[PDB]
Ligand binder design. Structure first.
Ligand code: QUI
Ligand code: QUI
Ligand code: QUI
Ligand code: QUI
Ligand code: MG
Ligand code: MG
Lengths: 8, 8
DNA sequence: GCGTACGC
DNA sequence: GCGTACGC
């Protein structure tokens, strides 16, 4: 759920 | 030489 | 429920 | 000359 590299 | 994650 | 970010 | 960054 976090999006720092994927954002899901 | 770039440092975005290692910086060497 | 998945992976992006740079060159001295 | 190497790897850091977050949870809905
Ligand atoms: C987001 O909060 C989150 C948490 N754990 C995960 C595990 C695997 C893929 C995506 C995820 N996203
Ligand atoms: C993004 O691609 C990514 C990959 N791994 C991580 C680990 C911990 C925090 C954030 C991250 N983001
Ligand atoms: C920095 O400019 C730079 C370029 N290529 C590398 C290859 C391997 C380790 C570190 C590097 N740093
Ligand atoms: C830092 O850990 C890191 C790792 N791989 C990369 C690829 C491309 C640009 C920057 C990067 N930084
Ligand atoms: Mg892509
Ligand atoms: Mg460390």
């Amino acid at each position: 759920x976090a999006x720092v590299x994927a954002x899901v």
